[PDB]
C-alpha cells in the first residue's frame, strides 16, 4: 500500500485517521511497535519529536496525529468545499485536540483522583460541538458543511472514547448522540469498527479507559 501507520498496539491518536482511511476505502499497512522496541531507544531517537505515530505516504514521512489527519483531508478531499469551510473544519479539529489533551492527561496522569472532577466538567466541554451541529442544517449532516471532513472522524473518535469513560454522557446532547449513531453506521466505517483490527486494540496504552 502507499500508506504506512507506525504505532503502538493501541487505538489512541491513530484511531481517527484509521477510521478515515477505512471509511474512504483506502489501503494501508500497520507497522506495530512493542514496548520492547520503544525502550530500545533507536526508533524514538529517529522520530522528529521523539513520538509516534509516524506515517508514510510513499517517500513523505510525517509525525503528529493532526498533521496526518490534515494531510489525508487535503489529499482525499475531506477539508471543506471552499476556504471558509476549511477554516471551520480547523476550528472544530482544534477544539477536538484541546479536549483530547485533557482526556490524555486524565488517563495517563491522574485517573483515580481526577475522574470525578473530569466527568462533572465534561458536559461544558461537549456543548460547543452540539452548538456547532445545531447551526449546520439542524445537526443532520456533518460537523461542517454537507460533506464529511477529517474533523468528523476526529470528533467521532473523541465522542466514542468519552462514552466509554462516562457512559451516557451524550444523553444530554441529542444532536451529538444522533451524529455518532449516524456516522458509525456508514457501511465501511461500521465494518471497520466491528473488526478485530479495531476491537482487539485497547483505547489507551496503560489499560485505563
Ligand X SMILES: O=C(O)CCCc1ccc(N(CCCl)CCCl)cc1
| Residues in binding site | 7, 13, 38, 44, 51-52, 64-65
Pick from 5, 6, 13, 170: which binds ligand X (CB under 6 A)?
A: 13
Q: Is 183 a residue that touches a second copy (CB under 8 A)?
A: no
Task: Establish how many alpha carbons lie within 13 A of residue 96's alpha carbon, considering only the half-sphere containing its beta carbon.
Answer: 25
Q: Where does this chain touch ligand X (CB under 6 A) — which range of 5-13, 76-84, 112-120, 182-190?
A: 5-13
Q: Is 153 a residue that touches ligand X (CB under 6 A)?
A: no
When the beta carbons of 23 and 90 are compared against a second copy, the nearer one is 90
For the CB of residue 95, give the shortest distance to ligand X in the complex, in Å: 15
Q: Where does this chain touch ligand X (CB under 6 A) — which range of 9-17, 91-99, 160-168, 177-185?
A: 9-17
For the CB of residue 173, give the shortest distance to Cl ion in the complex, in Å: 23
Footprint (CB under 5 A) of Cl ion, residues 7-66: 12-13
User: If you write DSSP's letter for every residue of 128-173 in order, what string do you get?
Assistant: HHHHHHHTTGGGTS-SSTTS--HHHHHHHHHHHHHHHHSTTGGGG-
Whole-angstrom distance, CA of residue 51 vs CA of residue 119: 28
- Measured at the alpha carbon of residue 134, what is the angle toward residues 128 and 135, in degrees to the nearest 5? 95
Q: Give the 3-state secondary structure of residue 38.
A: helix
User: If you write DSSP's letter for every residue of 58-75 in order, what string do you get?
Assistant: TTEEEESHHHHHHHHHHH
Residue 204 DSSP label? S
For the CB of residue 94, give the shortest distance to Cl ion in the complex, in Å: 14
> Are 163 and 157 within 8 A, CB to CB?
no
> Are 29 and 3 within 8 A, CB to CB?
yes
Annotation: binding site for glutathione: 7, 13, 38, 44, 51-52, 64-65
Element (H, E) at 96: helix 83-109
Q: Is 66 a residue that touches a second copy (CB under 8 A)?
A: yes
Q: Is 8 a residue that touches ligand X (CB under 6 A)?
A: yes
Residues within the interface to ligand X (CB under 6 A): 8-10, 12-13, 35, 104, 205-206
Residues within the interface to Cl ion (CB under 5 A): 12-13
Amino acid at each position: 500500500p502507499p500508506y504506512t501507520v507506525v504505532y503502538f498496539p493501541v487505538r489512541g491518536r491513530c484511531a481517527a485517521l484509521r477510521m478515515l482511511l477505512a471509511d474512504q476505502g483506502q489501503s494501508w499497512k500497520e507497522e506495530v511497535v512493542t514496548v520492547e522496541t520503544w525502550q530500545e531507544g533507536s526508533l524514538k531517537a529517529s522520530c522528529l519529536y521523539g513520538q509516534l505515530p509516524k506515517f508514510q505516504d510513499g517517500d513523505l514521512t510525517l509525525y503528529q496525529s493532526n498533521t496526518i489527519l490534515r494531510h489525508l483531508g487535503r489529499t482525499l478531499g475531506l477539508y471543506g468545499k471552499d476556504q471558509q469551510e476549511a477554516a471551520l473544519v480547523d476550528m472544530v479539529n482544534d477544539g477536538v485536540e484541546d479536549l483530547r489533551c485533557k482526556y490524555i492527561s486524565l488517563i495517563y496522569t491522574n485517573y483515580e483522583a481526577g475522574k470525578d472532577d473530569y466527568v462533572k466538567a465534561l458536559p461544558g466541554q461537549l456543548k460547543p460541538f452540539e452548538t456547532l451541529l445545531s447551526q449546520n442544517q439542524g445537526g443532520k449532516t456533518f460537523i461542517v458543511g454537507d460533506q464529511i471532513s477529517f474533523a468528523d472522524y476526529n470528533l467521532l473518535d473523541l465522542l466514542l472514547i468519552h462514552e466509554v469513560l462516562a457512559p451516557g454522557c451524550l444523553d444530554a446532547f441529542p444532536l451529538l448522540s444522533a451524529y455518532v449513531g449516524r456516522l458509525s453506521a456508514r457501511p465501511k466505517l461500521k465494518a471497520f469498527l466491528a473488526s478485530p483490527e479495531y476491537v482487539n486494540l485497547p483505547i489507551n496504552g496503560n489499560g485505563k479507559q
